């Protein structure tokens, strides 16, 4: 399992040795540590590195996590509840679960823990892109005023949503995604420990290349194909693609084949079905655009128009609450291009 084998220390990390050395350099003298913002491709291992740095700074007990419930009150009388994972030396906040009220959670909880007080407690903002601009504006002074009591470490995937002052106030730690060889080595260690019979080792490289640099997805796909072949991987073992990938692929096939409003009926139907089942719209647009680009029939002009309209409707999605209102427009514009 992905959780079955996860490094619990800095010295157990095996990929991007430069990042490990940088983290140990920061951990050498921990009383002087700037605010951090872990960023890179999703699935790289940024959270694992952040928790390994926490274990290096503090004792080995940072992994003894406990969930707690802290009820909060918004501007109205509505009651809002947050699960705050906490450790004796650190606590974690994921504000993406809340909506536009992440500002309140920030300003109340972080100020409270500041008043509460190895003289600092690190707070991990796992989801920093879903933080609204108002929440970041409220967090802008919390970092600086209470810098002697609270030292934030931020987990992020793309720095574009994060505003300039927040990036300025915090140190940036780049996280390159693992290379295919390192992913294959990790998969080899897993299959060796999990006692999975391998006919050859090209299977591992194929899984590594089918994950696009993702290690979490790599391990999940490994175990997924380990259940369809009875814990014995063969050369012709099919690569397990998640359901939403298959649905998006069929969507691209339909857009490429039927460029009609009657096809737009079912296109909107599929978009609604995907959105209603906990699937973000930006991910839908990204995967849809890249799968459309992979269509061999379309020539260069169609590809360029598709990527142009993808960027335009990506901006529209980033500045719009109603996601399908932009997704349908993008699909219709692509149909008009074709």
């Amino acid at each position: 399992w992905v959780d079955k084998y996860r490094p619990k220390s800095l010295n157990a990390l095996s990929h991007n040795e430069e990042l490990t050395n940088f983290l140990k350099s920061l951990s050498d003298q921990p009383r002087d540590l700037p605010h951090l913002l872990l960023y890179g491709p999703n699935g790289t291992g940024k959270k694992t590195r952040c928790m390994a740095l926490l274990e290096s700074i503090f004792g080995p007990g940072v992994y003894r996590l406990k969930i707690d419930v802290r009820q909060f009150v918004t501007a109205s009388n509505r009651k809002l509840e947050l699960n705050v994972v906490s450790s004796p030396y650190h606590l974690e906040i994921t504000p993406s679960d809340m909506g536009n009220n992440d500002r309140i959670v920030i300003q109340e909880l972080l100020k409270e823990v500041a008043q509460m007080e190895h003289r600092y407690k690190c707070v991990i903002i796992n989801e920093a892109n879903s933080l609204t601009k108002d929440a970041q504006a409220a967090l802008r002074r919390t970092m600086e005023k209470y810098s002697k009591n609270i030292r934030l470490i931020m987990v992020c995937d793309s720095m574009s949503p994060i505003i300039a002052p927040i990036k300025s106030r915090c140190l940036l730690i780049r996280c390159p995604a693992p290379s295919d060889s390192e992913i294959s080595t990790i998969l080899s260690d897993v299959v060796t420990n999990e006692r999975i019979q391998l006919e050859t080792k090209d299977i591992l490289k194929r899984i590594a290349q089918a994950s696009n640099g993702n290690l979490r997805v790599s391990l999940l796909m490994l175990e997924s194909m380990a259940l369809n072949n009875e814990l014995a991987l063969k050369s012709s073992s099919p690569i397990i693609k998640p359901d939403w990938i298959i649905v998006i692929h069929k969507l691209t096939r339909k857009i490429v084949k039927e460029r009609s409003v009657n096809s737009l009926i079912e296109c909107r139907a599929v978009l609604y079905d995907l959105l209603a089942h906990c699937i973000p719209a930006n991910i839908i647009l990204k995967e849809l655009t890249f799968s459309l680009l992979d269509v061999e029939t379309l020539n260069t002009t169609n590809k360029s128009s598709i990527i142009e309209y993808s960027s335009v409707f990506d901006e529209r999605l980033s500045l719009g609450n109603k996601a399908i209102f932009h997704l349908e427009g993008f699909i219709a514009k692509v149909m008009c291009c074709l």
Binding site: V2, D3, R6, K47, T48, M51, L65, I67, N83, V85, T94, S96, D97, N126, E127, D134, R216, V217, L220, E223, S224, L227, N228, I240, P242, D243, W244, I246, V247, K250, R259, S260, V261, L264, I265, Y272, D273, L274, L275, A276, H277, C278, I279, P280, I283, F313, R316, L319, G320, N321, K322, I324, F325, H326, E328, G329, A332, K333, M335, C336
Partner: protein, 614 residues
Amino acid sequence: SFPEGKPNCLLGLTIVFTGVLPTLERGASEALAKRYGARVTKSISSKTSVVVLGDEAGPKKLEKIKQLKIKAIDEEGFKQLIAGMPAEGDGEAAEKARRKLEEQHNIATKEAELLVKKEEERSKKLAAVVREEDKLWTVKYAPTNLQQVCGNKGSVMKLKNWLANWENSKKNSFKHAGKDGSGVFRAAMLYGPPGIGKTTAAHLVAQELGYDILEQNASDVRSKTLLNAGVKNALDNMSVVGYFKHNEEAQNLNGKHFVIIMDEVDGMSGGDRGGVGQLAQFCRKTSTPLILICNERNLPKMRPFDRVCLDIQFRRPDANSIKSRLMTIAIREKFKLDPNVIDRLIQTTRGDIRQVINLLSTISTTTKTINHENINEISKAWEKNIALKPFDIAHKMLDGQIYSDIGSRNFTLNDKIALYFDDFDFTPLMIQENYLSTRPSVLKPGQSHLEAVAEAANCISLGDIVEKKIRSSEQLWSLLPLHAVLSSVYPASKVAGHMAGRINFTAWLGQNSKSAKYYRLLQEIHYHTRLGTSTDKIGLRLDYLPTFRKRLLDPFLKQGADAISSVIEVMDDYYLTKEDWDSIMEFFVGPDVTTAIIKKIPATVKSGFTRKYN
């Protein structure tokens, strides 16, 4: 322009003004046709005597005319037909129209004479306190018996039967529905357009059957405390007025009991603290008849009332029924009324008898003869401006004629913006849901349907951006007309035309609620497995859930009931429960749907799994 004709020349002729006429617009042609007794219908049928179309006729409508063999004439044909046709319509149908007019006038005279006799008897009684001319025309001609109510005869009969058989159903404990079916409901609701006669009908049915009328205005008394106390001690109490009102005679046994006709039910306070939801619990446990009356039954505040009341939909009465009443009140008041303009009066007033009576009273002060010469000005000054329902907004906004060059002058852009502003919370959704299900008729030369759809969708994207700007922490409500344009008018103008199928309701609402529920479930699952998995909310659904299915559901598919122990170990490894398992099994889409898969699992396996987990 149009030559004059002798009166009622076009009587008994069914004329439909399908073609757009350059000389006169639709309403002017309809008025100049009704001036001579002609009948105008919106649907071409076998009974249609003549169809008037100069040019620009509907294609499907033209095929309908061709199949039904309806004669068609142009504007000049209409000009010549006005002179050609003889007076009073001769023709067999014209004779029938003559007879109908004569009977209507005869009943008008008879009721006028009856009213004069009643006034004479009242004068004699006074000789042996408010003077009659002091009273308004609405109250002085109010129906005194159920045979004078105009329209909705079936609703009146059903309500009368319900209130008559209420005692019999009470003896049966209301479990039995009865032959009519109005014996299982303790309370009845009368709802319809304002001024059609719900309150009068309720009062009259209460008076005829002998019950004691207790009237409470729900708008005046809407709080829980006042309504609670008053109406509760009213539900199970006899009438001291009913007892002291000559109980000795045995003709009316229902004199003791109460009929609580609660007027203006639509104005009660909403919410649990509001009494509109309390009355739902209140009316099922009552020992006296309840007659609730509201104007907008299809309201969110009135939802608790569908399953606890006998709905009764009073419709807008047709002008023919009110023709006799208007003729009577015109004969009595010494002002001349021509029945040809009565239909236009009702259409202008929109089936509101109270307002048409008020119009007759107010106009007659100066002008003693309401005729075809001043009907246009009367209509243009007295027309009801009623906010269109979110379905009629979708229909009209998605219409080719509205955005045409000729139609633009008739229906201006500011009118379109106001049409949006009638409902500013549902029109953008309705247009978005039904802008790509219409056959366009304003396509530019060299533009296909798909291009118009793409431009409209781009416009709706800009409108959604504008809406987010309006409905955010900045509250830029001064951009609301811009949102009206961007969301409703421009996208509809791009794809304007004829409605292909039906106007559906916005599906975004239900799917958004489903998304919120699934996000709540995913939040619970993610926070349950947080200790085991270092992921976010979205990443769990993206990646782990497919593998979680393979570690939970597939073992039940292949190993059988013996894989229960391993499944339980897997759930306990991440603190999952049966509810968590069910929620994850509902998260997959497309090829990996498990709704049929779980059904095909033997019931023994599922039962053993449940017992073992417990």
